[model samples]
Target: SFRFGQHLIKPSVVFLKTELSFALVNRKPVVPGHVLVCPLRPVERFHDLRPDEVADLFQTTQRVGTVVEKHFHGTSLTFSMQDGPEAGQTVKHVHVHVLPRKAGDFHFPASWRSEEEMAAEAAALRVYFQ
Candidate 1:
């Protein structure tokens, strides 16, 4: 199991994977198609990552971003990154938040969903990899 900050990630919720990183569905997504890409090594600080890990992280995020934008009918995309505690990163692990965007989308996220819902979406998204 992959450790995501303070939480232990469920394997079923992981939709994409790479040599050094993976992408998963968000439990409390800021938007409908919000997801996260993280390094496999579970480093909390972004600056702690190796050159290879840094390259793979963004590359994975880009690949996952494409599928998410299409699946959620997004016209634009938002990639939110927080490097440290002062940046409001709740999770200790480093993750790049990928969100699908459209017109008229603006609000703070207070929404939460069930694990089953996340898992189902993950299952659908996993089909895109191969």
Candidate 2:
């Protein structure tokens, strides 16, 4: 089970970081000290967020990521969402999963990852989008 927090708390499974609109990680962590960057208030849907809230979320997400970087020696990190129940979102609260990853830490099918491959893919996406 993911540990939820109102603020930064050590040894939490889901460090509930109440930043800006919400809370955040205090100390220690699960999976290389992960932080669930979320709003201060509770609102389940992403689209339900006001424009300002949405923008704040983005900036706060970045800030939380920087904090994670300072805490861990991960080669890479990622932010993602499950959205609703169908997307593996068990919680009613809206949040972005800030994952700090190292090479080979994940298993294939379940989890397969590589820094080289990810960087190449990122480059390809940039070029494609550009």
Candidate 3:
């Protein structure tokens, strides 16, 4: 199990799970293929990652990006991380945003979403990983 915001995600929604990190669908995606890659440890910042953890996280990021790109037919991928509280790290846990991007995909940002919507997206994406 993993925690996204205040909710705990069931193992079924996890796209990629590693010893050091895991990748899962974002509840409030910025775009269609937006996802979250996070370290298993409860570290708050990127710089806090150990050498092996750093390597694991980024390598997993690449793998997740490739899967998301092909699944969504994305033109490109956008990876973002807010390192600290001032930079908009809402959960305090370290996570990298892996978003599959296309032209003009963003206009207005949406707010927190419903559980059914998130579950639907997660279920849809789960097949690719499985």
**How do the predictions measure up, each by TM-score?**
0.94, 0.61, 0.83
Worst 10 residues of 2 by lDDT: 9-18
lDDT tens digits, residues 69-99, model 3?
A: 8888888999999989899988878889998
Q: Any runs in candidate 2 off by more than 4 Å, and if so which?
A: 1-19, 26-30, 107-130
Which candidate has the top score in lDDT?
A: 1
- Model 2, 44-75: lDDT tens digits are 77777788888887787776566565556567
Across 3-119, the per-residue lDDT of candidate 1 in tens digits comes to 787778999899988889999998788889999999988898989999999999999999999999999989989998898989998878999999999999982236687889899
TM-score of 1: 0.94
Error of 2 at 62 (Å): 0.7
lDDT values, one for every candidate: 0.90, 0.55, 0.80
How big is the positional error of residue 95 in model 1, measured in Å on the Cα after superposition? 0.5
